[PDB]
């Protein structure tokens, strides 16, 4: 049938189409998840409006992909999960997005309202389970209110401190029909509001910088979310202050900028008398701004959108509450009427240069060491020389990610996605799929350890199914953080042990991708060149030394 | 060196944790190590506990509750702080829905760093509480034996459920004097309770008055270890019975009194239904029309008093343990002279519907054409299933059709999506079954979608020498295949890869992989996989449009 | 007019809610009306339900659970949206801690206005859930009979607890055809369940071997309506027993086998303790040292299997209903021929310690000097309590000393702060008792601090003609008086008004007020208050430093 010559009603619309039109109206371009009861019509309706749907292999990776796409696009992107266990699997993405202050829209199906209390198929208190992990969580009780709830959730997830929003969609709401003309419209959510700091706070910030003898600027991913790279790069060029990038703050300032103190991080944090926080929290990543990693009398200028975050752990001398791009614009404006810049010759620049040269001399022999099995720094020598300038880099593991953080530079903002503020394993291939869906014209390279790849390695089939040429590089030392000798007979396997002889790259051959196995330093170069030139996804399985480690440091990263 | 003097009067929280777990009968611990639970896993191995490192906490949390169901005592799940606990919330929810015991042990950031934004600091007890029978943080190391005892008892006693113990870093590493730690009692078997005698007699009176009676055997009886009692009751009453999905095995599926081949007719026409440890939830279609008679009479045997009369009123309430109460029914039946007659119109209608459904699927079971349908595939699978095997089913058509084509003869020998209808339990359940029962064959039959939820755990099986048999029925999508995405249009949301070579994942970890497209290959491939001394994967490219047999009603409705 | 044609086919949610509550035995409804629950209370009265409007939702939620405990079925508390439900969270938490049934019915803003910031919009199911056995929102009017039946069943069956139903405005006012409303079954009596016979015999084995046995009668037996079987068990075993605070009355407090006068000695020296519906929580001092023997043996009779062996291991577990299991023990006592011997050293030590404690308080009971101590005041109070009275006790010294000086001879005749130690239950419990048992005297004895929590509810009693007798023991502070502040110093945080004339609050609402400062006034004032046909307040000013009898251990420790 379906003949156009035949009369049709064509005056009604159902909840799935309203959800699709509302999502597209609010800038949702990507939807990751796994279909089934009752959200099959939602994914189909999303495709009719132009929303790109991506079927994953686990809702855990799907929820991670939604927030990564949100951080990259700047607007909340969707995750579609089924009722019951589909939502519980997605709680991983809600908690992770909450800790990173990233937006996210989780759309979870539910059993029909008329069956509540009966023990229906996958009936669950889904709003209650998700509420403590979301900025916004509500159930859409009737289809004609879908435009209201979608605009509500997107605005709550995008405005202020970004967080996750959850919308519960019962099956009878998805399938319920309403008159096309009887549905109330909803306004389109615009750019998140930016606010400014008082003028006396701006001048007090510039005064404190001039009074500092060993100043240090710390650039966090809050500035990347603000798209403040232009303002920050103008601020560092105008002030000539040394800066330190956070893990995912890399790229906002080019990693090869001569004012970076990355190769002297411990000394810079320890000896600085004044610290300028740019969208960065004094949490575990920055060692709480307290001893034994900071001077007891460290002075703090804190720029954060959340007023409650000011003075946490270490008191802030100058508070700058508001948007990063807007406030740094003020600082650049107020600097134009001043002749102060950090002088070109100070003992502080002298000490930073020495510590950078000292740390480079410590890792230099390991970078050149060609003996097999290879160490971490030897592996990254061949990786780094082949990472394009506009690449998007996903990092996951312990030594693989942390050493890769210092060996893989980023010259553009929002081009690094790692374990983040939650220290999460399982974001690897989910972040890569999101990066490959948002920037299909840019290279996507995921560098994971053997343990990290096992959390989401099945998502490699997702990439090959949607033609995503993701370059997965596995650093297999045979365990979690460290290799282990093979157990004697009767001796159980070590709890951290994995499979050092595993051929993870054959998973790529299972889904039409390219697989490469490396055990010798002479194989590494040609194996990476082949995986880069391969028109499709690839896996390079590098068997590294079991005892390999990072260069020694005065303090432990966790302490 | 033993010559050097050493102080030995102190013990930390990880070792007290291991000793308490071993004392309470915890034999298996699944999880992934890392800060701060590494000492817990190491100390557990020192006390003889079997630790099994998984590839995702999601599968680890599913394996723990499966081992708890098989062993009959709460088993452990060890996860790191923060996202390790959040990833394991899947198992807590699934254990809660199935009324299975489970003990989740989650690490936590140091207490003295709370509020500072510590690494993986999280309100873990608050998140897990709505999914647990019991949830509490261990504040001091000297109270570990107390909390482990109370947690295991709360998971095991009464209606079983999940328990959670939060272990901060400072508690794990904190030392205490060994002679000062307060001992804890050992949690015994879950207490059993009986029904009043007039309830037992009223239940037998209702059975004798029924013209079309039906006993429904649920997995509560499998949990209660009541197979001997149920078998005696069915044998002496001659009552027809229907087995729930995981209730299969309590009665052997080849028993002549089974109505499984006429399930829809039995539920719709029965004038009396005897629920043995089974809920009137979605699996039994709520005991209501259009699947049941409006006047259906219910005898309900359940351990939870609040469950009696849900959806459909219960004429006779039997609240208590399934083994003890069926034992009462066997004893009260001795003092009578009744069994359901050997020739009734009810028995003839059941036999006629059974034969009718047999003739409906007979051409599909014999059809050798390629690509094969589901029933043709299971003809070779069922012919090679040992009678003592443990069967893991996962998917939609693969699991549902596998439920009718793969019979069970021992209780607690099928593990499927369960009452939650969960995808992601496949290889986690198989790893659990392979650990608890190393001398028995473990066969997991999954769809191509269900295998992707936990397919990484094949490395866990190969690393621990578990000869798991994974048979993948690949139709190229979720529930149904799909033609190629054409005309520049996107792929269908349910579509996966029909040409995927999942068996190559087995060769990634030293296992054996077999690829089957033709019906002539299925036999030799299954023979080789079963004889291979190690884990194996059989990937079968079935027809994209293959479906189950037509029914009067949809399974969900 | 009746001559006019009217359409009687439709019915709204408020009327359906009323008929469902009446069908499920809800006779009493306490609360405060307003948006949107006004049609609910009016509909309840139209079905014969007694509605009682309180002055605070705190006392309403408390009066509901007390009326439930007194009737044996869940009674209703009706509150408005937002702050009405939050004010009622007090009763939910208290009902959960005491294992008492309760049905809280909370109004809610219209569903079509959710997310808009509607009047008193609140996540009311989410806030109430961690305090209820059952919490759910009624989404459509046609499902009201279903939700009311399931809520009453959840609150009544198993271990009792609180139930919450969320009633949105559009559900209350929404209409549906009567003929299409799905009917609901009537929730019957809570199911009882027996203990296995080998546990019954093992329990009697332990009792025969014990040299110093002690039975403890908890209020779980009073809820089970087991007074007949407990009185038969004690009489035939001739065992010493100890009543818990609200377990008083199950056995008559004047029974010669009571060890109430030697409570501390009986607990510390007993080699076997028989818990009858009593927990080893703070009330029974955890069954642990320094209040019990290290190696004390425990027979524990509880309905909750998870409660067995808490703090102190249970040697013999008796999981099931109190009345039913004690009935088994009485049957098994016939096959035996054992009683605890008439002359044992254990009986001589109990009698000597009872006589010692009476000689320690005898001078205080006899001291006629004014201002009076606690025991002198209770001398005239106890002599004027009818044997069929209902005693409400609240405060610290007032309640604790009143527990030992006001005997109960019938069960479920005493209501006090309970397992939560709540201040604010006084006048709410009294209104509940006066509503449920109008033919019995209701005497409430409160401290000055406890009366301030709910004293405004005296207007409710006068408004409904409840002759509640309120006796205030005013020492001018919380647990202890205070010298008036001097030298410009601030008032003590525990101090109140020692010269307050609380009895004038009774005169504000037509009741009778009496003020007492000397022992010569106490008698005549109590007589005139008991005879006054109406509610009354007797305000007694006691010595600021009056205290309880000294003990070896503090009640809390
Ligand atoms: C918390 C941290 C920000 C702390 O940072 P650090 O590791 O201490 O500093 P890094 O920037 O990583 O650099 C490490 C050291 O290398 C030096 N360094 C940096 N760059 C260079 C270059 N280019 N050349 C030579 N040396 C270099 C730098 O000065 C440091 O030495 P020094 O100056 O001498 O210190 C980070 O470790 C982190 O985010 N880790 C992730 C934790 C996580 O999520 N793990 C996964 C879950 S773990 C499951 O248990
Ligand atoms: C809810 C159910 C218990 C309903 O059971 P049914 O499928 O209706 O009955 P089944 O026992 O499975 O058998 C199906 C039909 O085959 C008949 N049958 C049974 N055994 C046989 C044999 N041996 N031979 C021939 N025919 C048989 C039986 O009488 C039924 O026909 P009729 O008598 O004619 O009916 C079950 O479908 C179920 O639990 N499904 C799991 C749902 C799930 O979790 N899916 C994954 C998530 S789905 C994501 O959206
Ligand atoms: C926790 C308790 C069960 C502990 O019981 P005890 O007070 O120790 O025992 P009681 O039965 O009350 O009796 C106390 C003592 O009086 C003795 N006693 C009892 N009857 C008599 C008679 N008739 N004559 C003489 N002496 C007697 C009894 O043997 C005890 O002495 P000895 O045997 O010599 O010890 C109880 O105190 C309680 O429930 N308190 C409630 C606390 C509360 O909720 N407060 C409100 C919130 S508090 C705000 O901070
Ligand atoms: N638009 C914005 N402008 C300024 N600050 C922001 C903005 N958005 C988020 N932030 C802040 O950035 C902070 C994120 O810091 P964090 O993620 O800990 O940085 P890092 O982990 O890179 O050190 C949050 O406290 C958040 O309040
Ligand atoms: N020892 C026991 N005795 C009796 N019933 C039990 C026991 N343990 C659990 N149960 C009950 O068994 C029921 C399980 O039902 P369900 O999982 O729905 O069965 P199925 O899914 O096999 O139909 C639960 O309601 C639970 O209360
Ligand atoms: N019908 C019943 N039969 C037996 N025990 C019951 C019954 N109903 C409730 N209980 C149990 O009685 C116990 C109440 O003890 P508790 O409130 O501590 O009494 P007390 O305060 O007098 O010591 C609870 O553990 C509850 O599970
Ligand atoms: C969700 C989650 N699970 C587990 C961990 C614990 N742990 C921290 S890093 C890591 C993997 C480290 O090993 P690997 O990925 O192989 O990198 P390597 O250090 O060996 O190079 C894990 C599993 C975690 N942080 N998060
Ligand atoms: C955690 C979870 N996610 C999603 C679903 C939805 N859905 C129901 S069955 C199923 C898989 C069905 O496909 P498959 O495993 O290939 O079996 P098939 O029917 O195709 O043979 C899924 C994903 C679910 N039930 N649980
Ligand atoms: C809801 C609540 N509020 C406060 C308390 C604290 N406190 C315990 S008893 C009590 C009052 C005791 O004093 P009173 O009622 O005057 O009797 P008294 O001991 O003075 O004779 C209070 C307020 C409590 N237990 N519960
Ligand atoms: Cl090179
Ligand atoms: Mg590794
Ligand atoms: Mg499929
Ligand atoms: Mg007082």
Numbering used by the authors:
A (entry chain C): -4 to 554
B (entry chain D), C (entry chain A): -2 to 554
Describing publication, verbatim:
In all ApbHACL/S structures, the whole tetramer is in the asymmetric unit. The monomers are structurally very similar to each other, with root mean square deviation (RMSD) on superimposed Cα positions in the range of 0.2–0.4 Å but locally show distinct conformations. Therefore, there are four different representations of the active sites formed by four slightly altered protomers in the tetramer. In these two structures ApbHACACL/S-CoA and ApbHACL/S-fCoA, the distances between C2 of ThDP and C1 of hmCoA are significantly longer than a regular C–C bond (1.54 Å) with 1.8 and 1.9 Å, respectively. Additionally, the C1-O distance in ApbHACL/S-CoA is 1.4 Å which is close to that of a regular hydroxymethyl but 2.0 Å for the same distance in ApbHACL/S-fCoA is much elongated. This suggests that these two intermediates found in these structures represent slightly different reaction states.
One such enzyme is 2-hydroxyacyl-CoA lyase/synthase (HACL/S), which catalyzes the reversible cleavage of 2-hydroxyacyl-CoA (2hcCoA) into formyl-CoA (fCoA) and an aldehyde or ketone. Originally identified in the mammalian α-oxidation pathway of 3-methyl-branched fatty acids, HACL/S has demonstrated remarkable catalytic reversibility, as it is capable of condensing fCoA with various substrates covering a wide range of aldehydes and ketones with different carbon chain lengths. All the enzymes are tetramers, specifically dimers of dimers (α2), where α2 dimer represents a catalytical unit.
